[PDB]
Amino acid sequence: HVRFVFPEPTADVNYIVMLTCAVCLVTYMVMAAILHKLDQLDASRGRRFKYEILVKTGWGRGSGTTAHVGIMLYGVDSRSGHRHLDGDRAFHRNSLDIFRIATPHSLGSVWKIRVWHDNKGLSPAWFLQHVIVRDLQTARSAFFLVNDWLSVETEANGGLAALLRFRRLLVAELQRGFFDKHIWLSIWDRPPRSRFTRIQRATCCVLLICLFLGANAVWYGAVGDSAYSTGHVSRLSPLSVDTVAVGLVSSVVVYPVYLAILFSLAHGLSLLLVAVAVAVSGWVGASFPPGVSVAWLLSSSASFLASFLGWEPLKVLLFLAKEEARKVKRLHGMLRSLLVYMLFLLVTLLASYGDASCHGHAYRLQSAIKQELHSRAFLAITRSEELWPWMAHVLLPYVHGNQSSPELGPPRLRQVRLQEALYPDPPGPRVHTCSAAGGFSTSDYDVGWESPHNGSGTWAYSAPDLLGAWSWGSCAVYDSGGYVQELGLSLEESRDRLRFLQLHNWLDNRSRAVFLELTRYSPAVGLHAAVTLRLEFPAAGRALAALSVRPFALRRLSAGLSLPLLTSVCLLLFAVHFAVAEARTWHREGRWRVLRLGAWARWLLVALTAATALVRLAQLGAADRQWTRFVRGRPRRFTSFDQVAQLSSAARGLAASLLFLLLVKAAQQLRFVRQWSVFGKTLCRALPELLGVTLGLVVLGVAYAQLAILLVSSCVDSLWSVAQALLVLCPGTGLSTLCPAESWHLSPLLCVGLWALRLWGALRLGAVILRWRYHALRGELYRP
């Protein structure tokens, strides 16, 4: 009673599966190029241990023939193969060839060696001591020869002729095919003279990965007619019986098709099979609630780990040489670095683009909130007596005027007194932002103003909260403290409270701030929005309005194993790994190396990753705390949410910056192509000249900005003739508004200077340098 059920989803798309598949395909695209380079390196060619001891035995009579010999010896992460060499004697009778080659037999000082010649005819009675090697560079052998005699071409055993037993025959293969048939950890351990091509192995590995992903996606999206495979018992938290029990089953059922291609047309067959697998995985991925994608990822990781450690380990039971070695070592290092970087990029992409559906909805939500609240009307108020009519006509119909996206919490008004009543400048010309600032009042006041009869005042201070504050006003930095008014719950009582505040001089005396802000929920898209309205009052009659609508998603730490939690812990692990690596390098390879670039980028990356992870964790914790505070009771308690929105914005910005750095580094590593290595080289070869040119440009831009603002300050109504035409203002405001009254901030100066530098063609001077450099580097790689 299971059969199969078609998901039949909506038009929505899940980006986690698509991103994972895209990463898994592009990593193979890079793997193919690197492994093809290494194969062409070891395609035709390549088909301390050796010392200055007597490795020849010519005392024998008729103890040799024209053939080949080999020595098999393994050790601690060391092995060897066969040998084949000859000269002019062509391996004559009892030939004493005291010579060694640059073989990869970098074995240790262990008493395990098997030397076997080739049975060129009948059984040879040769009695040679050994290929003695004592000490050349590292003393990896022992100066002792056993001179053991074996059968025809039989592997004569020795240390640093009828033994055929499982204690020797099979135990010897415990190191022979241990890592050759282990297809996962075998891309860099392929013995030569074999028909593997090092691309079939990678193709099979990607086949396994893609089929793991496809099987898990099909199980989580199609086979769900038993326990709803969602929420009831398959919770997103690791249950140890639903996350691994599916991965193991998927691996077991996918082995039969993976074993079918092992050792032509297999390349195209595997390509089309992984194409259909990724297509079906993407098609089924749409019907994925956000709580089950993490379970699918965990199941895929567990299945890969089980395949790497569970079945493949038991699958086995069924001159110019130094530069070549250095090049292959460099290729292996590049390969592992590529794998690590690809995992890091996948983690970063999941952290940043985990929820891309809410990003489009947040913009429309905030635009609708702005347009329904009459943002233009509020931002254009200048007198402290139209705020009450604005609240009467706009805000109150918006709160109690039942409509979509309910408020979810009463509003509140918070004031700071400043206890330093200000004498206002006569109306007319503007004053420079704000001035005449003193201290912040803290005392209590009864109805009206300062008048304590029995105890504390009716308008208590309402001390600031520990967490969530610092709105960062226009020219001041505030907190979460100040006298608070609840504004009431119903519309009728709200009118009475507003009239009571108006008639009792709640704001007219000092009038520093009002801080109108509550909340707003949207369950259709599942997004909250913190709305903040502030009136900063530089002086009596001078008003500055501020409106900010910040949309966010309330993800709680108590929800379990959310995707942000997994991304944060992965980022923390990556940052720890990078920090340990760079600290080890800085401590071992000399000291005081911070004098040059390269020791700064790694620290910057570590700091960025740590900041991202910690900010995300702090946002989760703050959201959980705020929700727990609000849930316990909501008669009139406010429980603002501004800090959660600010933390979410900071985390998003940090993740975007980290992804930007990763993409830039990915662009940097394109130099490995033969003809594409020039470009970056020139960019790092013309740096001093570009720095000198940009210093000159900075001086010229500063000079122009000084000239271009000493005469636009003379705005009035007529600047000049030449200065009005031969002048540049950076894009925006084509018709100049002139008169930069208290608005000549740093940013517009940089804007106008930089844009004026471009229009006049001053930046094109860079070409004058770059071209010359490109003409020199490209001539240094053709002739020499």
């Binding site: 990003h359 939500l365 609708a368 909130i369 329904e372 003809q675």
Partner: protein, 455 residues
């Protein structure tokens, strides 16, 4: 053929229609028009308002001539697409003060039940097949061809009464998600039908998003001599395309099995494929004029011309791309002196390096685009979508941008983004292209001149 299809000034036709329907204020006292709709009450004011003024023109139940030339064919039709209450899940701790939430539009969450005073087709769901409709691909989402529809009348009084009856028994509630208005005109002076479709989207988050579409068509083609001339030219074009197909097949089959390392044979097959697609589209479209025959025998019903407009737009796009590539193909023949040959040689030699550097340039461009989308994508109205970010940066290169909006979205990282973008785009990336091109041109000219002058 392109001059024939892009006829004389029909720009003024659609211009007058649009300015009549889009730019007219909804009322004598209001300043809002269709292009600047704000809420649902504004939509109701527009419906019984500027729309009725622009539809019926006074001159037994005489017909309506919109400009005393444009004849209103049949009657206009209004349609609504809405979702159902209960397609939306809310947290269990919040199910005390809120009871109703409506999901975003989707085919799975559509409402297919009668509502209100269930009397006619305006309160009964009609399937897409029964409406002869199709998808639209609006702005927020792609909408189905079904919904609740009403066919208006030929006179103004009856249409006004119908709209008043729809408004009195509330028809656009919080569950609605899209509204369509459709009609057509003829303008018998020239031979050119016009199809008008106005769409209003009500997103779940709130607000109103309007859009419009005015499309001219020609369905009675063979009238004058120029029409016969155009038909003859089209037949000649078909013969030319057949000849090119035969030549391509013969010259790929006999020899040259590689055939693709030239860039002058891939362009030919691209042109052939595009032209064959255009011919097939035209053949399939011109034979489906049965809607016109059905309408002409009963002129009191809504004529369905949306499919013809869609296929006309597709044909126009295909023809434009094909003619652009045909014009590009002219470079194969401009080689007739030593001056024009060396420029082609320089371009062909520098193409590889330009592509190699353009890969890196586009990677950096997309890094900037994704950073801008993630940072400014919720407050600026110009970075709301990724492709919009790409277009915004391409406009920043031209200098067509407003720096005020970007800085007020973020005091920090706002000026930094613009400054670093402009600097690294005009001081570094723009000059490497010049370096590569100049080096290639210099080496080509030098070697050509040295081998030519020393022979």
């Amino acid at each position: 053929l392109t001059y024939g299809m892009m006829s004389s000034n029909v720009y003024y036709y659609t211009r007058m229609m649009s300015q009549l329907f889009l730019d007219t204020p909804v009322s004598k006292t209001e300043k809002t028009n269709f292009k600047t709709l704000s809420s649902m009450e504004d939509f109701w004011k527009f419906t019984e308002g500027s729309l009725l003024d622009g539809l019926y023109w006074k001159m037994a139940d005489n017909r309506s001539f919109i400009f005393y030339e444009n004849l209103l064919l049949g009657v206009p039709r209004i349609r609504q697409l809405r979702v159902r209450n209960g397609s939306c899940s809310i947290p269990q701790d919040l199910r005390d003060e809120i009871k109703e939430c409506y999901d975003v539009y989707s085919v799975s969450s559509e409402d297919r039940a009668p509502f209100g005073p269930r009397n006619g087709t305006a309160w009964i769901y009609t399937s897409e097949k029964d409406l002869n409709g199709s998808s639209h691909w609006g702005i927020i989402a792609t909408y189905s061809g079904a919904g609740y529809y009403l066919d208006l009348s030929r006179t103004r009084e009856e249409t006004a009464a119908q709209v008043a009856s729809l408004k009195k028994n509330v028809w656009l509630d919080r569950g609605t998600r899209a509204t369509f208005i459709d009609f057509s005109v003829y303008n018998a002076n020239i031979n050119l039908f016009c199809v008008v479709r106005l769409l209003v989207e009500f997103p779940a988050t709130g607000g109103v998003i309007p859009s419009w579409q005015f499309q001219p068509l020609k369905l009675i083609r063979y009238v004058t001599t120029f029409d016969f001339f155009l038909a003859a030219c089209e037949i000649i074009f078909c013969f030319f395309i057949f000849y090119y197909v035969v030549e391509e097949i013969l010259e790929i089959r006999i020899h040259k099995l590689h055939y693709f390392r030239s860039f002058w044979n891939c362009l030919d097959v691209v042109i052939v494929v595009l032209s064959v697609v255009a011919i097939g589209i035209n053949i399939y479209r011109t034979s489906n004029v049965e809607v016109l025959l059905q309408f002409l025998e009963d002129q009191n019903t809504f004529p369905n011309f949306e499919h013809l407009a869609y296929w006309q737009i597709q044909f126009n796009n295909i023809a434009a791309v094909t003619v652009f590539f045909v014009w590009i193909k002219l470079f194969k023949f401009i080689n007739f002196n030593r001056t024009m040959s060396q420029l082609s040689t320089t371009m062909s030699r520098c193409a590889k390096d330009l592509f190699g550097f353009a890969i890196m340039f586009f990677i950096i461009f997309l890094a900037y685009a994704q950073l801008a989308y993630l940072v400014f994508g919720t407050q600026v109205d110009d970075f709301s979508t990724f492709q919009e970010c790409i277009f915004t940066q391409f406009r920043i290169i031209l200098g067509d941008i407003n720096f005020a909006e970007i800085e007020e979205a973020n005091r920090v990282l706002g000026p930094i983004y613009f400054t670093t973008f402009v600097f690294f785009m005009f001081f570094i990336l723009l000059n490497m292209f010049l370096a590569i091109i100049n080096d290639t041109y210099s080496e080509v000219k030098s070697d050509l001149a040295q081998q030519k002058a020393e022979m």
